[PDB]
Amino acid sequence: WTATSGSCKGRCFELQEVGPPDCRCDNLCKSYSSCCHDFDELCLKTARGWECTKDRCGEVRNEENACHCSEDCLSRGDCCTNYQVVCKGESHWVDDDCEEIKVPECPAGFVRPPLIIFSVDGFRASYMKKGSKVMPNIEKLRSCGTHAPYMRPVYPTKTFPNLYTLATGLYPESHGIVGNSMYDPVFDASFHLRGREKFNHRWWGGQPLWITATKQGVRAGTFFWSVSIPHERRILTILQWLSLPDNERPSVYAFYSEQPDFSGHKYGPFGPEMTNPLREIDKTVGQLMDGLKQLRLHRCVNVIFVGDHGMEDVTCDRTEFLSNYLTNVDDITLVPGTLGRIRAKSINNSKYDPKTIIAALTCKKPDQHFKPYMKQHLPKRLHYANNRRIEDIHLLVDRRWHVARKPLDVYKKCFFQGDHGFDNKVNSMQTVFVGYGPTFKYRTKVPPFENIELYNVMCDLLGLKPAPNNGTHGSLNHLLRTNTFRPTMPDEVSRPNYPGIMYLQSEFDLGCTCDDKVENKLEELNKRLHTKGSTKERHLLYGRPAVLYRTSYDILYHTDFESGYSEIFLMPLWTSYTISKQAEVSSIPEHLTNCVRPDVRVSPGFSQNCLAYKNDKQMSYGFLFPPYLSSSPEAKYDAFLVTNMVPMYPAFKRVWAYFQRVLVKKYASERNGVNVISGPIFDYNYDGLRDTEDEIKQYVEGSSIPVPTHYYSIITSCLDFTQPADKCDGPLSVSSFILPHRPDNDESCNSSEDESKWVEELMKMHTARVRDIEHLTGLDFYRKTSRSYSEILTLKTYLHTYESE
Ligand SMILES: *[C@@H]1O[C@H](CO)[C@@H](O[C@@H]2O[C@H](CO)[C@@H](O[C@@H]3O[C@H](CO[C@H]4O[C@H](CO)[C@@H](O)[C@H](O[C@H]5O[C@H](CO)[C@@H](O)[C@H](O)[C@@H]5O[C@H]5O[C@H](CO)[C@@H](O)[C@H](O)[C@@H]5O)[C@@H]4O)[C@@H](O)[C@H](O[C@H]4O[C@H](CO)[C@@H](O)[C@H](O)[C@@H]4O[C@H]4O[C@H](CO)[C@@H](O)[C@H](O)[C@@H]4O)[C@@H]3O)[C@H](O)[C@H]2NC(C)=O)[C@H](O)[C@H]1NC(C)=O
Ligand SMILES: Cc1nnn(Cc2cc(C(F)(F)F)ccc2CCC(=O)N2CCN(c3ccc(S(N)(=O)=O)cc3F)CC2)n1
Ligand SMILES: [Ca+2]
Ligand SMILES: [Ca+2]
Ligand SMILES: [Cl-]
Ligand code: NA
Ligand code: NA
Ligand SMILES: [Zn+2]
Fold first, then answer.
1. Which residues of 238-271 are buried (b: 16+ CB within 10 A; e: fewer)?
2. What angle do CA 170, 172, 177 make, to 5 degrees?
3. Is 137 helix (H, G, I), strand (E, B) or coil?
4. Annotated region Nuclease-like domain: where?
5. Hey, which of 89, 245, 454, 512 has its CA 20 to 30 A from 418?
């Protein structure tokens, strides 16, 4: 019930919410059908439109008008945004030259520069260049302030997950808005864009910026706008709140535009019909900036211009139908479109089987335009699994396509020419970031970054402590003139042991063999120095990784590589080696094919054994430092130490051996040397965080040797490739991956072909940030470089995407 006979007189766009049944006058009352009877008349005035004209200048105030051009409008804070231009000979903000804002220039009574977030739906990154001729105000923000060539959204690249990620700094698996449509099996309730379930607070986790602000004493405008409120009235409302008295005035505001997304779905991302929505959005930015200029706030407020996701060409004919693959199509529920999520239609059917659905959807048609995954197998960079609202079975849809359950779903629903939701590394899905104001830098371009980082920066802009989130605070310090956050590196929790030679060969009973009994004081002191760390500066270039949890591990040195060997997991946590551009690849010699050698620094009890692999018919082994890249025949024996061995499915060994034999030397050639850190990851509860021992679900049969869910590598070189990786004076360059450790290559449809045709494609799909690996291992890399810590945090958030420009 709403008692809609209250009044909005003196309450239009009130900031505090009034509870049912009393009627509301806030910017969300329409969406709840709860506005007072006189909300339209009082709060949504339209008379005489949105612009002053010469003949209105100096008019007698008429309270009916949408906005005013009477002499008293400046002190009332309700002039039309163009009032000073039409009536007082002033210029539009866009016509003024840009001039560096070195210090905030704020009216007295302003405690801090306000922040205005101007959010645009479906604004594809490339619109900034391609539409620049019809967007002069946006182009002035971009060229005079701080801009990125693009900003990466979160997956799925849909509105609700992304706007709420912008507001919280959280991945959708953590904040709970994992799609525009969701079923929660614990609530037994469905969330949809249409209707009332979405307003229930139980769906929305984390802490959005307006709550962070309010908890810390910083007042916030209400961020949400009902769709029927015209944009001109939204801008006027913001400008009116900015005229409130000091103690009542908010410091943070949001504007939202449904465009250009609305027209992009109808016309495609570059339909000729898209020029006018871009012009209209630019005009709205111009009203805001003119309005700030009237209030003397145009060199006081920080403005962020930001989008939720881009837009791709998608039409009805590019739809795959599950009815062309599955026999049982009526036994499933599909969430369809630019991603798929599948679950059982009925929980009472125990002849539903995910294994059979996946197999029926795998590589079944030559050009197939989607790929099925159990969610724990999705690329870890998507961070899309740890939530009960994410169905176990997921379809990753190719850009430009849809999936649907049956043809009748698509013609009983062609209209549309645009859509979005695909993998967040797809170029068409990228969106925009510009920051302009006293706290942002002047005429500065910054590299692309992820939208999960912005909440921390918005908190820095407002002097707030951010709630715990998934940004890396400090990684965006290079966007800011001041208010930077100066983090300190985490403290190491476990210090390593440095074992020497402590065991005789006969103490080991591992079932391993090696033909190594090939028997010099010159060369002998030398090999002793290598085991004590004499080449360590060449192979460990950025210091040893720090171990941020409690565990027992050993540093082991070798001529060609250094490792941190876990006595608990029986294998290295990390293995670090440098490969110069001059390095040569060699074979594994015949007599060494099955060689595994006890390591006399590490007890039998803290070693793997060969018998376990012999007996486990599913599981084989590989090595972390590759024997192919040994510096000499004699050094190569170190690569067969049992402390360099790790468990690998034979199907995974295909991928790993090709990476190590072919790709590393390719990278060294191209990048002028590389330093590689490789290791295992265990994430059996798919939470993106390092597993403890009692979470491990699989061991090499009959043993305590844990099986990794993934293998990573971090591949670092000099950004100035004219300097070799091991003698780099300035910034670094990194690419990394987290490969899933699977017992088949069903993910790669062309895996019967030579590895040259499919392995690197797989690795690109599983590209990762160094920070993703940090979460999954509890290790902290790049501890000892020449570089500032914020620069290193930016390097750790980099993702190498393998998209063109
Ligand atoms: C990205 O950043 C985020 C934020 O930093 C990281 O997420 C944090 O990760 C921590 C570990 O996974 C986690 O800390 C746990 O908190 C538990 C208390 O939880 C409530 O309180 C917080 C704070 O206000 C709150 O935000 C939580 O919100 C979640 O849950 C509600 C729904 O109930 C949602 O609305 C909301 O969206 C959010 O859901 C997400 O997180 C949960 C897990 O908390 C998932 O289940 C969801 O799928 C979704 O992703 C809560 O309201 C606390 O209980 C935990 O302690 C347990 O484990 C420790 C080990 O130290 C042990 O001492 C205890 O025994 C205890 O276990 C007991 O319970 C078990 C379960 O019943 C049981 O098995 C045992 O036998 C025991 O009885 C733990 O400290 C923190 O909640 C989240 N925060 C958020 C906001 O998500 C995230 O990791 C980052 N991601 C990456 C990749 O880095
Ligand atoms: C979601 C979400 N999370 N946080 N916020 C708040 C937020 C955060 C941020 C920012 F600062 F974070 F950037 C910036 C702006 C906003 C306000 C967004 C807003 O006013 N709307 C209401 C209209 N919405 C909407 C879209 C489409 C349809 S449909 N399918 O029926 O056409 C129905 C809808 F209700 C989009 C959200 N929105
Ligand atoms: Ca959107
Ligand atoms: Ca885990
Ligand atoms: Cl969805
Ligand atoms: Na085996
Ligand atoms: Na295959
Ligand atoms: Zn859309």
1. bbbbbeeeeeebbbbbbbbbebbbebbbebbbbb
2. 120
3. helix
4. 541-805
5. 454
**Nearest ligand, CA 681:** 4
Q: How far is CA 458 from CA 133, 199, 254, 347, 461, in A?
A: 29, 25, 12, 44, 5
SS3 assignment, position 768:
strand
Does residue 159 carry a catalytic annotation?
Answer: yes
Measured in Å, residue 174 CA sits from the centre of ligand 1 at 9
Give, for 739, the enclosing helix (H) or strand (E). strand 732-740
Using CB atoms within 10 A of its CB, is residue 399 exposed (0-12), middle (13-18) or buried (19+)?
Answer: middle
Q: Does domain 505-797 have CATH number 3.40.570.10?
A: yes
Annotated binding residues for Zn(2+), written as ranges, equal 121, 159, 261, 265, 308-309, 420
CA 388 – CA 687 distance, rounded (Å): 12
In this structure, are residues 169 and 454 in contact, taking their beta carbons and an 8 Å threshold? yes
Is residue 643 a contact partner of residue 649, using CB atoms and an 8 Å limit? no
Resolution (Å) of this entry: 1.6
From the candidates 81, 146, 157, 159, give the one annotated as an active-site residue.
Answer: 159
Cβ(118) – ligand 2 distance below 6 Å: no
What approach was used to elucidate this structure? Answer: X-ray
**Whole-angstrom distance, CA of residue 772 vs CA of residue 521:** 46
Q: Which of 174, 175, 187, 388 to mutate to test the pocket of ligand 1 (most atoms within 8 A of CB)?
A: 174
